[PDB]
């Protein structure tokens, strides 16, 4: 999610950029499963013209816990990744990101509390298009597809089990702005649908990793979100979002996301 990882990127003056995100959240699936997590991230990039092509590196850290009827667990996770965000002046945008995540990994509880480690590769694409009804108000249909190569664990003892999540999203966001000569603030809200297909699949164990959160390999949610894009003078932007989902086998019950962007050059 480009807006959630980063912000509003439109018409940033200044070729350099640094940023930082925090996402806290909580969700729940079946068999008494529920999780909570705090995800902290940071990144740096260089904006190009031609066409606003932001391109950078990012590092992530995720403290995560989870509990079912069969276990409690915890997972500390660390990640890195490259991104390219194309903000067209026509209103269209494309966002490409590729990241690696390393989870290590506590599960309890046969017998034993079990310390172990897993990882994943993820490649993401997002395309969208902001159409302005008025200068104050716009509508933005969005689509994003994420494909991954997780090597996690299956089931006593834990043999490894590799699988390929495919997660798809389509939705629309609408926003209206308010502005001085310094400050800009865009209230926004969105609806959408999200699906994931966990290829191979049914036998992957559910831990505190945030990976498989479900029984089986298919799930579908309705996405609801509401948030702000703040804009202060020429360098500093920040943007908050609150999310929630419904009708899924797994469901986000709460989630907060803040961005913060110091843009310079």
3-class secondary structure, 3 = helix
What are phi and psi for residue 7, nearest 5 degrees? 150, -160
- How far, in whole angstroms, is CA 178 from its chain's centroid? 27
String of DSSP letters for 199-250: ET-TTBPP-SSSS--SSSSEEEEEEEEEEEEEEETTTEEE-EEEEEEESSSS
- Among 200, 258, 235, 234, which residue's Cα sits nearest to residue 41? 258
CA 255, 62, 160, 168 dihedral sign is positive
| C-alpha span between 200 and 7 (Å, rounded) | 35
- Declared resolution, Å: 2.7
CB distance 38 to 24 below 8 Å: yes
CB distance 45 to 83 below 8 Å: yes
| C-alpha span between 39 and 78 (Å, rounded) | 10
3-state secondary structure string across 27-73: EECCCCCEEEEEEEEEEEEECEECCEEEEEEEEEEEEEEEECCCCEE
| C-alpha span between 9 and 12 (Å, rounded) | 6
Q: How far is CA 66 from CA 16, 63, 71, in A?
A: 38, 11, 8
What are phi and psi for residue 30, nearest 5 degrees? -80, 180
CB distance 20 to 41 below 8 Å: yes
CA 243, 223, 239, 25 dihedral sign is positive
| C-alpha span between 226 and 215 (Å, rounded) | 29
Expressed in angstroms, the distance from the first to the final Cα of the chain is 25
CB distance 54 to 17 below 8 Å: yes
| C-alpha span between 143 and 127 (Å, rounded) | 5
Using the CB atoms, write b or e for 163-174: b if 16+ within 10 Å.
bebebebebebe
Domain parsing of the chain, residue ranges: 1-265
- Among 8, 26, 28, which residue's Cα sits nearest to residue 17? 8
CA 65, 255, 141, 97 dihedral sign is negative
**Architecture of domain 1-265 in CATH?**
Beta Barrel (2.40)
Joined together, the tokens standing for residue 123 give: 């490649």
CB distance 127 to 3 below 8 Å: no
CB distance 33 to 65 below 8 Å: no
């Amino acid at each position: 999610n480009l807006n959630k990882r980063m912000g509003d990127l439109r018409d940033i003056n200044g070729e350099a950029g640094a940023w930082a995100r925090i996402m806290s959240g909580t969700g729940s699936a079946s068999g008494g499963f529920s999780d909570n997590y705090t995800h902290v991230q940071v990144g740096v990039d260089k904006k190009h013209e031609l066409l606003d092509l932001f391109t950078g590196f990012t590092v992530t850290h995720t403290d995560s816990s989870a509990s079912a009827d069969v276990f409690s667990g915890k997972t500390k996770s660390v990640g890195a990744g490259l991104y390219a965000s194309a903000m067209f002046d026509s209103g269209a945008y494309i966002d490409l990101i590729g990241k690696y995540v390393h989870h290590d990994n506590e599960y309890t509880a046969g017998l034993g509390t079990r310390d172990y480690s897993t990882h994943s590769w993820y490649a993401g694409a997002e395309a969208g298009y902001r159409y302005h009804v008025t200068e104050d108000a716009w509508i933005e249909p969005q689509a994003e597809l994420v494909y991954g190569s997780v090597s996690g664990k299956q089931f006593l003892s834990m043999k490894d089990k590799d699988y390929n999540p495919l997660i798809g999203r389509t939705g629309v966001d609408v926003g209206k702005s308010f502005s001085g000569k310094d400050w800009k603030v865009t209230a926004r809200a969105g609806l959408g649908y999200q699906f994931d297909l966990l290829a191979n699949g049914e036998t992957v164990l559910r831990d505190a990793s945030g990976e498989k959160r479900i029984k089986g390999e298919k799930d579908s949610r309705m996405l609801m979100s509401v948030g702000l894009n703040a804009e202060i003078r020429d360098n500093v932007r920040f943007g908050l979002e609150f999310e929630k989902s419904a009708f899924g086998k797994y469901n986000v019950d709460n989630a907060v996301n803040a961005n913060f962007r110091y843009s310079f050059g």
